[PDB]
Amino acid sequence: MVGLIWAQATSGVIGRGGDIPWRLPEDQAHFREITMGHTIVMGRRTWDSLPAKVRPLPGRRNVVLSRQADFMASGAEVVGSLEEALTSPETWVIGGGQVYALALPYATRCEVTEVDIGLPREAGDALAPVLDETWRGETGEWRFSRSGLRYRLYSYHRS
Numbered sequence: 099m100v101g102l103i104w105a106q107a108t109s110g111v112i113g114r115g116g117d118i119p120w121r122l123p124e125d126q127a128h129f130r131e132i133t134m135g136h137t138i139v140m141g142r143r144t145w146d147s148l149p150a151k152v153r154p155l156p157g158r159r160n161v162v163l164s165r166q167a168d169f170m171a172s173g174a175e176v177v178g179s180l181e182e183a184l185t186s187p188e189t190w191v192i193g194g195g196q197v198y199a200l201a202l203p204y205a206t207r208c209e210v211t212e213v214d215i216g217l218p219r220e221a222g223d224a225l226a227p228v229l230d231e232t233w234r235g236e237t238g239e240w241r242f243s244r245s246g247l248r249y250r251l252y253s254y255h256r257s
């Protein structure tokens with residue numbers, strides 16, 4: 099099982115300036131619940147975004163994709179191809195934009211948080227992958243985050 103999990107603005111933006119232009123504690127807790135215990139696979143730029151104290155993310159096999167043969171990620175495995183990362187019953191691809199696009203052909207689940215923020219797409223933004231007709235989606239109800247932004251959870255599945 100390969101799943102993708104991400105949070106996006108309604109525009110599709112997932113990252114900007116190497117970080118994220120929001121933070122919803124409820125979305126982080128949801129991310130923790132879904133990924134805990136499993137393999138998480140991330141691009142090197144997303145590893146760089148992690149604060150030193152949650153590097154590695156605890157209780158998970160942290161895998162970092164890089165073309166740098168000597169890149170060092172203390173507490174993670176660095177691999178040079180996505181296929182090397184897929185050796186566990188449940189693998190969660192946690193981004194960013196480049197790695198979501200690379201992993202989508204392997205994926206059967208997407209757990210999406212839509213953040214009700216009006217954020218036009220700018221050059222250099224990382225974007226969510228586009229999900230074609232093979233993806234069956236189910237939406238949850240809109241929820242208020244204590245951050246003040248509304249959000250809702252989408253669960254996409256395909257065989």
Ligand SMILES: NC(=O)C1=CN([C@@H]2O[C@H](COP(=O)(O)OP(=O)(O)OC[C@H]3O[C@@H](n4cnc5c(N)ncnc54)[C@H](OP(=O)(O)O)[C@@H]3O)[C@@H](O)[C@H]2O)C=CC1
Pocket residue numbers: 103104105106111112113114115116117118140141142143144145147163164165166169177178179180192193194195196197198200224
């Ligand atoms: N809102 C959300 O849900 C999420 C947001 N983000 C945000 O997204 C942004 C980062 O996304 P993005 O910029 O797309 O960078 P990525 O996180 O996708 O990492 C890109 C890097 O991954 C490596 N990589 C990419 N393709 C391959 C390949 N085929 N083989 C080997 N290594 C590969 C390279 O590493 P190297 O350069 O070392 O070779 C490349 O520079 C940040 O802003 C981050 O905060 C990240 C995750 C989720």
Ligand SMILES: Nc1nc(=O)c2c(CCc3ccc(C(=O)N[C@@H](CCC(=O)O)C(=O)O)cc3)c[nH]c2[nH]1
Pocket residue numbers: 103104105123125126127128129130131144148152155156192193210211
């Ligand atoms: N839906 C979704 N939201 C995201 O933000 C995200 C990301 C961004 C990277 C990310 C995710 C969680 C935490 C982090 O700190 N995680 C902690 C939770 C800590 C807390 O609850 O405050 C963890 O242990 O997972 C730190 C960084 C990838 N895929 C995602 N998918």
Ligand SMILES: [Co+2]
Pocket residue numbers: 131132133134135136
């Ligand atoms: Co689980």
